[PDB]
Structures are given as structure tokens and as C-alpha cells.
Amino acid sequence: NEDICFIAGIGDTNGYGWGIAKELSKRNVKIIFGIWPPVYNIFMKNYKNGKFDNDMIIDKDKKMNILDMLPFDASFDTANDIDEETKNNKRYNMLQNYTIEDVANLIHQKYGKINMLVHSLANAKEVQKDLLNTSRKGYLDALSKSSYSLISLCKYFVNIMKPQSSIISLTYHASQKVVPGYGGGMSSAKAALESDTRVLAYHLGRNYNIRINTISAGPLASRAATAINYTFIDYAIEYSEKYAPLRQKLLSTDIGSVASFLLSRESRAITGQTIYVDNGLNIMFLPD
Amino acid sequence: EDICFIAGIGDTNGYGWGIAKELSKRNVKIIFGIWPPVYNIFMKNYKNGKFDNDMIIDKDKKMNILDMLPFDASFDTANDIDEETKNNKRYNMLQNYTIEDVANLIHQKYGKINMLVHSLANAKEVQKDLLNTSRKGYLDALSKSSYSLISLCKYFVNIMKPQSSIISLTYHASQKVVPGYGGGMSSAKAALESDTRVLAYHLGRNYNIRINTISAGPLASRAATAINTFIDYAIEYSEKYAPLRQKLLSTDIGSVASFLLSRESRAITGQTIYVDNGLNIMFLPD
Amino acid sequence: NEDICFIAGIGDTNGYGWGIAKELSKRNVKIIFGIWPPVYNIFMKNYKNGKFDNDMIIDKDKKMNILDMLPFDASFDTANDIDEETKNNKRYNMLQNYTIEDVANLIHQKYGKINMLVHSLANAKEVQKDLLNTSRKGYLDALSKSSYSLISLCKYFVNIMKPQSSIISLTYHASQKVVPGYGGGMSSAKAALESDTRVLAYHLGRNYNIRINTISAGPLASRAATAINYTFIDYAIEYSEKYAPLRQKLLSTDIGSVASFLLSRESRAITGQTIYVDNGLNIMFLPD
Amino acid sequence: EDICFIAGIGDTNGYGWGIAKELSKRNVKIIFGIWPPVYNIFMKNYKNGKFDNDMIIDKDKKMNILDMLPFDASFDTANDIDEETKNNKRYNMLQNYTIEDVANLIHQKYGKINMLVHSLANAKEVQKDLLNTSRKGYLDALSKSSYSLISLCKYFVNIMKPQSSIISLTYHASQKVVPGYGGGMSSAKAALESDTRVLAYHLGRNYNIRINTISAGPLASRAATAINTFIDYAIEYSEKYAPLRQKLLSTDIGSVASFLLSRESRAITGQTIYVDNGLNIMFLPD
Numbered sequence A, C: 001n002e003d004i005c006f007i008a009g010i011g012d013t014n015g016y017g018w019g020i021a022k023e024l025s026k027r028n029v030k031i032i033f034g035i036w037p038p039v040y041n042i043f044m045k046n047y048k049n050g051k052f053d054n055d056m057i058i059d060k061d062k063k064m065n066i067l068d069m070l071p072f073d074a075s076f077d078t079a080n081d082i083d084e085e086t087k088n089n090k091r092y093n094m095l096q097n098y099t100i101e102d103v104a105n106l107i108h109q110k111y112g113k114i115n116m117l118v119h120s121l122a123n124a125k126e127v128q129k130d131l132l133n134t135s136r137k138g139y140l141d142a143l144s145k146s147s148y149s150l151i152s153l154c155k156y157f158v159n160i161m162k163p164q165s166s167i168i169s170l171t172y173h174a175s176q177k178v179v180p181g182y183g184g185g186m187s188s189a190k191a192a193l194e195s196d197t198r199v200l201a202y203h204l205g206r207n208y209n210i211r212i213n214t215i216s217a218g219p220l221a222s223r224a225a226t227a228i229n230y231t232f233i234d235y236a237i238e239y240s241e242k243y244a245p246l247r248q249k250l251l252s253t254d255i256g257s258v259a260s261f262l263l264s265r266e267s268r269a270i271t272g273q274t275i276y277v278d279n280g281l282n283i284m285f286l287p288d
Numbered sequence B, D: 001e002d003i004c005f006i007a008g009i010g011d012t013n014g015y016g017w018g019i020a021k022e023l024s025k026r027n028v029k030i031i032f033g034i035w036p037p038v039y040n041i042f043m044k045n046y047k048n049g050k051f052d053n054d055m056i057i058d059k060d061k062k063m064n065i066l067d068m069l070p071f072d073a074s075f076d077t078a079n080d081i082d083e084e085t086k087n088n089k090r091y092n093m094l095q096n097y098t099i100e101d102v103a104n105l106i107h108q109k110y111g112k113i114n115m116l117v118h119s120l121a122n123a124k125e126v127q128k129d130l131l132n133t134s135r136k137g138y139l140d141a142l143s144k145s146s147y148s149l150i151s152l153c154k155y156f157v158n159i160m161k162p163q164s165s166i167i168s169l170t171y172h173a174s175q176k177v178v179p180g181y182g183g184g185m186s187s188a189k190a191a192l193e194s195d196t197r198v199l200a201y202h203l204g205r206n207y208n209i210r211i212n213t214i215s216a217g218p219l220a221s222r223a224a225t226a227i228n229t230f231i232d233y234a235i236e237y238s239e240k241y242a243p244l245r246q247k248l249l250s251t252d253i254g255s256v257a258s259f260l261l262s263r264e265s266r267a268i269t270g271q272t273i274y275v276d277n278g279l280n281i282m283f284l285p286d
């Protein structure tokens, strides 16, 4: 009764956010999407035109139920943070209550307290550049949008969450081992995120009895994954399917069912952890 | 039908039982492997109803135990048992309790299984610090606590379905110093965690079978009381300093095991997963 | 002949920068100090008034030789990055060539190419706040000054360094395990720094044959260490001296002699590494 | 005067020799512990001047070797040698080669030492994958490659000065899967790295003695050629993909060992230090 999850970072059905929504929907969790304003209207129109109907089919006995879909920008902590330019920009002008604080307030006002929170977003202006060639501003952009946004989400959402709630984010192994092409300070951002997951786990655990973990996912041909540049993601997938201990296609719903477990009471003694869902690729040193 | 063999249950106070309870919730059939020295007292307590309250899952269900078999992880095959054991009071009345014999017996009675739990450890010199542990004591720890996992996998893969899943239990003393966790137990756990990776590679590639290990926080089990109030200290420190200040239950480990043993976790393998209320993340007590 | 080291982050004789200078000076490496403008004039006056004379004594057979002392602010990559306000500020107005690019240029013009580089600096406006309570701006400040500054230093100094040169920075274990009181995103910054050390090691190793490592140091009662708030550092030191495998006072020159090794040819097969110099405290789980 | 015992030199092509060379540079007196099966061929090659070119440090200096003694890390004390070894062709002509006997002999001839190097490993089933390794094969790997370090420490601390330093060599297969590194060698290295921490605690607190381990990249030593062209592949892959694309030399490991064994590193203990041209940091070949 009333397992409600906010998923921050869905723009289509091709990423981990959607796989997570599907698996949770399967367990009858109510789902609220937080959608970035640059893609929000296109997502809504597609949704309304039934473009996602096939993708919403669970077992053909069940179909996903989505409780709400809200414009959301993890760049802005409160309304006072929004620069006049953004506020007035073509894609933002007609939207409201999309900062982290406002969206938590809106969710609370409409549905009461929630018990599950998903951070499924990242961004970096200079992702295409190697770390050495990343500018101060590009690096800080990657940290701001990909890492600090988690801390802020936690800060504002803990107020609208029940004790024993659970929070997850997504990370990538480039934080711990070198992945050429994962540029722009994304590796730095993921390293910060994994460390912040531990520190937040301490504070949230002690003060709120709330858990936080992160899933280190293997490669998935999402929309963001193309932004990296056959392309970077095509090589990653090919390499993973050839060399992982489990040689099988990694699905967004593989991450989804792990997410679902971490967000449930079944994982109540797990917190502060980086959990690898990557067909075991992370354990390998030397290829065959 | 799901069937899980759980090697290392002696009573209802350890992690093996909590894992059994949680799997039972999900309608998994459970087979216990019981160390022969305690096999007859276990059967007696069970028959006398000592475990009845511990078997209740809820209003609806009671634990279904498919079978309970003697199992000694010291011995790979029938040929490995020495005379002194053959002659032992608690062994002479039992049979087919080597790792291979148990695999063959389960397969013959019940067919193929799809879940395997290693929940056992031993070290005859656990009360000595590592520096004062003898070669025989150290190798005993590795033999009983680490190699037993490899042997379990070796003999059991033949009786397991593709997409089966295996777990063991470990402890953070492998990675950081726990004074008191002596006799090469820290060594054995480090080997277990590394072996979990290497086995994940061979089992995943050859059989599409997953293997992970759960690094559990402290629980006042029978084996824990043999370390030297060590466990009293560990539990008190964990409950005081862990990010989550709730009592760690065997079923907290059990529900994670159940997930790792299910298809829900089909993309996780070779991993050490911490189920310890977050204690492992702390650097210094606040 | 001509082992020259630039040490970025010395403001007095109480920190790791000074211990590193001493140990290198011991091996006859020439030392150039990069001194932050807020403390630069006070450092120079103290130096000129002989206040550091005792602290410069090596074995009483030898005394430290300092080749140069340059104003340096790791906040600014190039002259074009300096805001008009800073440029005109009381402490900056009378200084020149203190951005990362300008200082590399100046060093090159005066002394030619160098072969050793030390990043011994960190800053975070909100260090006193817990991570959960750190603002976006405070967090980005910590990353900018403590982590990105390393990348930028590398980017500009690789041009004035010889092949087979070596770079080190300093980090702290709070990046990997939770240290309450290490706030403001300093833990996040150190996690980024350790990850960036690997990524830089790849690029610098492959393109320049230059090594980079970081030293994870135990507690030292430096000036910065008081900024954290008996205080945070007093407890850290007390705890380290009581519980480390080696129960002995950790000296800045203990870090210095490790730094010196990492910067020398003796460590030519080590790169991308986080090296712990902390009397072994990091290996402990449970106290006695 | 500094004196270092180096256990595990068989010829001039391994890490033991490179460590000996580098310590010699710093005027450390060197004592070799040589596995009895190869002790007589080593002495013969040495006398015949086979190693003369390898002993040159430079224009100035030649390696000073204080002594060369038979040493078998399989045996803790005289009582541990079985008859079959006593009767063996290559052992019967040698004596005082157990770990305790060597410590006693060195102490009696030369007094206290202050540097100790464990540079040895063995595993009779190295060519089998972990899953197919027998209990006896696995325990042999742990016995010879891991427990030998604990025993070395146990017997040698008595003959060492306070502020002494100990190192061993390990390999990244303990932490990440290297197909080919079989027979429980990966297991033994994981135990070695964990044991390095636990020993650092006991040795640091009780004796103020430091212990670290160097995780080395691949070198075409004698033992390396026994793994199954494995080493040819490892070296080629390392030289192609490591951040530093220079040939890894035994003396690259030797200069790190020398530093860790000196007072320069007085604040480092319980650590695994990677000396591998940075290869360990890479996630996937570019």
C-alpha cells in the first residue's frame, strides 16, 4: 500500500530510468517521472500519442502504470537559483515547480510522503574531451549536474520521505579504473558520487533511518550514451558481451530488478554501497 | 520448482537458518547439509520440536524442509576420510557425507537443483593471532573455509541447472584488520572473496552459473561465541557506530541471499555484497 | 644536476608542503615555492626576517636551499580567468604572473624545464558543514580548488617538464571511508582527485612518459587542518597515535621522504597510484 | 650495517635478484635463501662466473653477497621434514634449511638483521584452473606461497632489530581475474595481501616492525615460464596497454623494495604497492 517512487532522469524508453520504472511497476510501486525541460514536451507528446505503449507492456498480462510526470531540472536547488535567462527560455517559460525543492514540495502536496527515490541522470558539457583537456567550467558542470544533484535531491527529499526509505543512483566503473573516452570529468563526477554515497549513507542512516546505495551499471545503448561519440557505446557493449563472465545482452530491466531490490525492505541492511550490475565485467583484469 | 542446498546449518542461531527462512518465503525447497559431529543432536532437537517457533514464516506459512543430510566439507570423496574419523563416535553411524557423496545423493533423490549456499567456516586455531598460527592450523582454516567452496562448486555444478546461482558468506576482516579474528580466518576469507571472482569467470563462461559472496556483519551464532565476548564487542560496536542502528538479523542476510539466488540478480556475479548496516563504510568511530 | 621541483601550496612551515621541501632539499633538488596571494607577503616578510631559519635546518650540517618563491593561485588557469575584483584586490593588486599558465611560463623563462611537480593544496568554503548541508556553490568551490586545480596544473606544466618527470598530490582517506567532520565536499574532492590521478596517469604516461601519483597522508596539525574546527585535527592525531599499527608521531617529513621517492627515478614503474603514508591506520577496521 | 635476507633466488632472472642488486647499491649486505632442489646448480653457476655480468652495479661497485644458504619454505622446523625429502638426492647433502634453522644460522653467523624479503611462490597445480584444482594442490599453493610469509615473520622477528622492515611480492590476480593464473595461486596471493595487513598490525604494535607487499607486473622469470607463453602474453599486453610503455625490469621492482626496506618509508605499513607501469589502473584496452 503506497510504495511511491520518484525517478529523476527519464527522457524516453531507451535508458536505465525506464528499465527501473518497469521493474518497480511490476511490483506495484507507483511511479512519478521527473523529466528534464529540454525533452519534457516531446516526451509528453510521444506518451500521449501512444508511442510508448509497446514499451509499457510488462508481461502482456500487466502494463506499466505511471502516477505522474513532472518537469524537473536537477541543476536548480530552489526557485531562487534559476537565472532569468533559463526562466524565460523557450523550453522553460511555460513550466513551473521544476527545481529540486519545488518538485519535492509539489509531490508532497499531491501524494504525501514517498518511500523510494531514484537519481538516474548525468550531464557534462565536455564529455567528448579527455580529462586533461577539460576546462574548469566543463569539469564543474559535470560535478554540478552529475554528483551535486544527488546531494541536493537527498537534502530536499528526506523531508518528504518516510523513515526506512531508500535512495539509489547510477554510476559507472570509469570512477575506479581508466576508461578512455569517458571524458569531460564524468569519471571524476562518478568517483565523487560513489564517495558521496557513503557519506550520505552515514548522515541519512543516523538522522533519518534512510538508506542510500548506487548501482554501477554496465553499458546500455541509451540516448545519453551516444553523446559520448561504431561509437564509444558500441565498442563498450561489444567488449562487455565478449569478455564478461556472463556473455548475454545487458538489459535496462536487469538494472531495474536490482534497483527494485535495493529500494525495497528486502535490502534493509545494505547502505552506502556501490553495487555492480554489469554481468561481472568489473572483476576481469586480462581478456582472453 | 526451486531447490536450494544449504551447507552449514547446526541450529537456528546462524546465517544458514536465516537464509533458509527467507528462501522458504519464496517457496524454495530447502535441503540442509549438517556437520556430522552435530547431525544427531540437530535431528533430536528438530524431532523434539525445539525449532518449531523458529520455522514459522508467518500466519500463512511454515518452513518446508525437504531433507537434512550429514555433510562434512573437510572431505571431497569417500577416499578422503581418515581412519580416526571412520572410527569416530559421531561419524561411524553416518554415511555418504563427503562433498561428492552429498551431491550424488541429492541428485539421486531429488534431481537437479538451482541454488547453492556455502554457510560454513572452521579454523582449529581461531583463538591465536595470525603470527602465532601454525602451518597445520592455517591450512585447516583455508581447507575448511575456502577450499570447501571450490570443491562444493566442482561437485555440484554437475547437478545444477544452467542459470543456477551460488553464494557464500564472508567477513570484512579479509580486507581490514580485526584483532581477534585469528587462526587464518582472515586469510581464508580473503581467499574466499578472490576465489568468488575466479569461480564467477569459469562458472559464468562454462555453465552460465553465477556466484557471489555476502560480507555479513556480526551475529551471535554458535561459531561466533568461539572467537576470543569478541562477538559481544563486535555487535555492540556495530549497533553503536553503523550508519543504521538497528539490530542485524540473520533474516537481513537471508533476504539478500534470496535475491542473489533468484533470477532478479541475473546481471550480478563475482561480487562481495556487504550486508552489515553499512558499518564497512566508516573510517573512525564518531 | 638540475632536479627542479615546483611545490604549489606552501604558506608556512607547519604543513606537508614544507616537509616535502625539506626532504627534497636534502637530496639536492632545487625548490620553487608557489605561494597563495592571501598569505604571500606575510610568508615573504617572515622569511626575510629569519623566522624560518630554524625550520630550514636539515641535519645542522645542511640547511634548505630555496631557489625561488612565486605568488600562485590555483583558482585561475590563465590571466583571462582572473575577475576584475580579484585583479584589483588589496592582496592581489601588486602581484603578477600568478595564474597556473603564467607561473609555468615564468618558471620556464627563468629556469628552463623542470622534472618534479607537487600539488600540496586544497580549499573548500563550507568545510565546516556536513556534506548533506553543503550548498551547490560550496561543493563546486571544493572541487574547483582542490581537484580541478591538479588537472590544470598538469595541463600547463607538462609543457615545461622533461619526459620521465613525476607529479604528486596529497589526499585523505575520507574519500574512501566516512570521516565525520571532513565536510564541505572535501571528501568528494579527494575522491575526484584520486580517480583523476588514474586518468591523468594514463594520458600523461602515454603522451609524455610522465608519472602521477597521490599520497594519502595521515593527520598533521597544519594551519589548514585547524580550519576544520580539542578540535577535529586534535582528535584525528590522538586517534591515529593510539590506534595505528605504528604508534609514533606522524611528521611532515615522513610524507616528505615518500614524496621524494615518488618524484625520483627510483619509482619509475609506479603511476596512477594512491600511496598511504599514515602509519598504517587505513588498514584497521575495529579498534582495540 | 644493514643486512637483508632474501628468500627465493634461483638464478638472476627473477625479482629476488633485482631486489638484491638495488639493495647492494645502497651498501646493504645480502644473504640469499635458495630452494634446495636448485641450491647446488646455483652455487655451480655462481662459481663458474655465470652471474658475473649480472652482479655489476656500475663502474664503482659489484654486488657484495654475504652468504648463500639452502632454504625451504615448506618446512618450519627440523621436525617438519618427511623421510622422502630427507632421502632426496638434492636434499641429503644439505642441512639446516628449514625456516627456523635458517633464522638461527644467520643469527649465529652474522647477528641481528634489519631487512627481510619474501620472494617466492609455488603451487603444484598452477596449470589447472581454480575449479579443477585439488584440495592438496590448493593447500600446497597456500602453504608455500602465503603461510611461508607468516612463518618467515614468526622465526625472523627474534633475529631482527626494532624498526626493521619486511616485504613480499604479490600479483593483481588476487584482486581481478587472470585466466591462466591457476592452482590456487590467485587465492594464495589474496591471502598474502590480507595477511600483510594483519601482520602489519601485530608486528607494528609489538615490535615496531613494518611489512608491505609489492604487486609486480610481469617479468620473464623461471617460475613465470611454468604458467600456461602465459608470460609472453602478459608482457606483450602490459607493454602495449600500460600507461608507461617501457620494459618492466626486475630492478624497477628492486628500487621500490629498497625504499620500502629503508627508513625513508617509516610511515608506510600493511600496504600493497603496485609496481607495474600503472597497468592495474586500466579498465579496458584502448
Ligand SMILES: NC(=O)c1ccc[n+]([C@@H]2O[C@H](COP(=O)([O-])OP(=O)(O)OC[C@H]3O[C@@H](n4cnc5c(N)ncnc54)[C@H](O)[C@@H]3O)[C@@H](O)[C@H]2O)c1
Residues within 6 Å of the ligand: A008, A009, A010, A011, A012, A014, A015, A016, A017, A035, A036, A039, A072, A073, A074, A075, A119, A120, A121, A122, A123, A145, A170, A171, A172, A216, A217, A218, A219, A220, A221, A222, A223, A224, A225
Ligand atoms: N547508459 C549506460 O551505458 C550507463 C552505464 C553506467 C551508468 N549509467 C548511468 O545511468 C544514468 C542514466 O543514464 P542513461 O544511460 O539511462 O541515459 P538516459 O539519457 O536514459 O538518462 C539520462 C537522463 O537524465 C536527464 N537529465 C540530464 N540532465 C538533467 C538535469 N539537469 N536535470 C534533470 N534531468 C536531467 C536526461 O533528460 C536524460 O533523460 C546516468 O547517470 C549514467 O551515468 C549509464
Ligand SMILES: NC(=O)c1ccc[n+]([C@@H]2O[C@H](COP(=O)([O-])OP(=O)(O)OC[C@H]3O[C@@H](n4cnc5c(N)ncnc54)[C@H](O)[C@@H]3O)[C@@H](O)[C@H]2O)c1
Residues within 6 Å of the ligand: B007, B008, B009, B010, B011, B013, B014, B015, B016, B034, B035, B038, B071, B072, B073, B074, B118, B119, B120, B121, B122, B144, B169, B170, B171, B215, B216, B217, B218, B219, B220, B221, B222, B223, B224
Ligand atoms: N556470525 C557472524 O558474525 C558472521 C559475520 C560474517 C560472516 N559470517 C559467516 O557466516 C557463515 C555461517 O556461520 P555462522 O555465523 O552462521 O555460525 P554457525 O555456527 O551458525 O554456522 C557455521 C556452521 O558451519 C558448520 N561447519 C563447521 N565445520 C564444518 C565442516 N568441516 N563441514 C561442514 N560444516 C562445518 C558448523 O556445523 C556450523 O553449523 C560462516 O562462514 C561465517 O564465516 C558470520
Ligand SMILES: NC(=O)c1ccc[n+]([C@@H]2O[C@H](COP(=O)([O-])OP(=O)(O)OC[C@H]3O[C@@H](n4cnc5c(N)ncnc54)[C@H](O)[C@@H]3O)[C@@H](O)[C@H]2O)c1
Residues within 6 Å of the ligand: C008, C009, C010, C011, C012, C014, C015, C016, C017, C035, C036, C039, C072, C073, C074, C075, C119, C120, C121, C122, C123, C145, C170, C171, C172, C216, C217, C218, C219, C220, C221, C222, C223, C224, C225
Ligand atoms: N594536514 C593534514 O592532516 C592532511 C591529511 C591528509 C591530506 N592532507 C593534504 O595535504 C595538502 C596540504 O595541506 P596541509 O595539511 O599541509 O595544510 P597547509 O595549509 O600546510 O597547505 C595548504 C596550502 O595550500 C595553499 N592554498 C590554498 N588555496 C590555494 C589556491 N587557490 N591556490 C594556491 N594555493 C592555495 C594555502 O596557502 C596553504 O598554504 C592538502 O591538499 C591536504 O588535503 C593534509
Ligand SMILES: NC(=O)c1ccc[n+]([C@@H]2O[C@H](COP(=O)([O-])OP(=O)(O)OC[C@H]3O[C@@H](n4cnc5c(N)ncnc54)[C@H](O)[C@@H]3O)[C@@H](O)[C@H]2O)c1
Residues within 6 Å of the ligand: D007, D008, D009, D010, D011, D013, D014, D015, D016, D034, D035, D038, D071, D072, D073, D074, D118, D119, D120, D121, D122, D144, D169, D170, D171, D215, D216, D217, D218, D219, D220, D221, D222, D223, D224
Ligand atoms: N615474474 C612475474 O611476472 C611476477 C609478477 C608478480 C609477482 N611475482 C612474484 O615475485 C616472486 C618471485 O618470483 P619470480 O617471478 O622472481 O620467479 P623466480 O623463479 O625468479 O623466483 C621464485 C623462487 O622461489 C623459489 N621457491 C619455490 N618454492 C620454494 C620453497 N618451497 N622454498 C623456498 N623457495 C622456493 C624458487 O627456487 C624460485 O627461485 C614470486 O612470489 C611471484 O609470485 C612475479
Ligand SMILES: Oc1cc(Cl)ccc1Oc1ccc(Cl)cc1Cl
Residues within 6 Å of the ligand: A121, A122, A123, A124, A125, A127, A171, A172, A186, A218, A219, A220, A222, A224, A225, A227, A228, A233, A236
Ligand atoms: O555514465 C554513463 C556510462 C556509459 Cl558506459 C554510458 C552512458 C552513461 O551516461 C552518461 C554519460 C555521459 C553523459 Cl554526459 C551523460 C550520461 Cl547520462
Ligand SMILES: Oc1cc(Cl)ccc1Oc1ccc(Cl)cc1Cl
Residues within 6 Å of the ligand: B120, B121, B122, B123, B124, B126, B170, B171, B185, B217, B218, B219, B221, B223, B224, B227, B231, B234
Ligand atoms: O566469520 C565469522 C565472523 C564473525 Cl564476526 C563471527 C563468526 C564468524 O564465523 C566463524 C568464525 C570463526 C570460525 Cl572458526 C568459524 C566460523 Cl563459522
Ligand SMILES: Oc1cc(Cl)ccc1Oc1ccc(Cl)cc1Cl
Residues within 6 Å of the ligand: C121, C122, C123, C124, C125, C127, C171, C172, C186, C218, C219, C220, C222, C224, C225, C227, C228, C233, C236
Ligand atoms: O585534507 C586534509 C585532511 C586532514 Cl586530516 C587535515 C587537513 C587537510 O587539509 C585540508 C582540509 C580542509 C581544507 Cl578546506 C583545506 C585543507 Cl589543505
Ligand SMILES: Oc1cc(Cl)ccc1Oc1ccc(Cl)cc1Cl
Residues within 6 Å of the ligand: D120, D121, D122, D123, D124, D126, D170, D171, D185, D217, D218, D219, D221, D223, D224, D227, D231, D234
Ligand atoms: O606470481 C607470479 C605472477 C606472474 Cl605474472 C608470473 C610469475 C609469478 O610467479 C609465480 C607464479 C606461479 C608459481 Cl607456481 C610460482 C611463482 Cl614464483
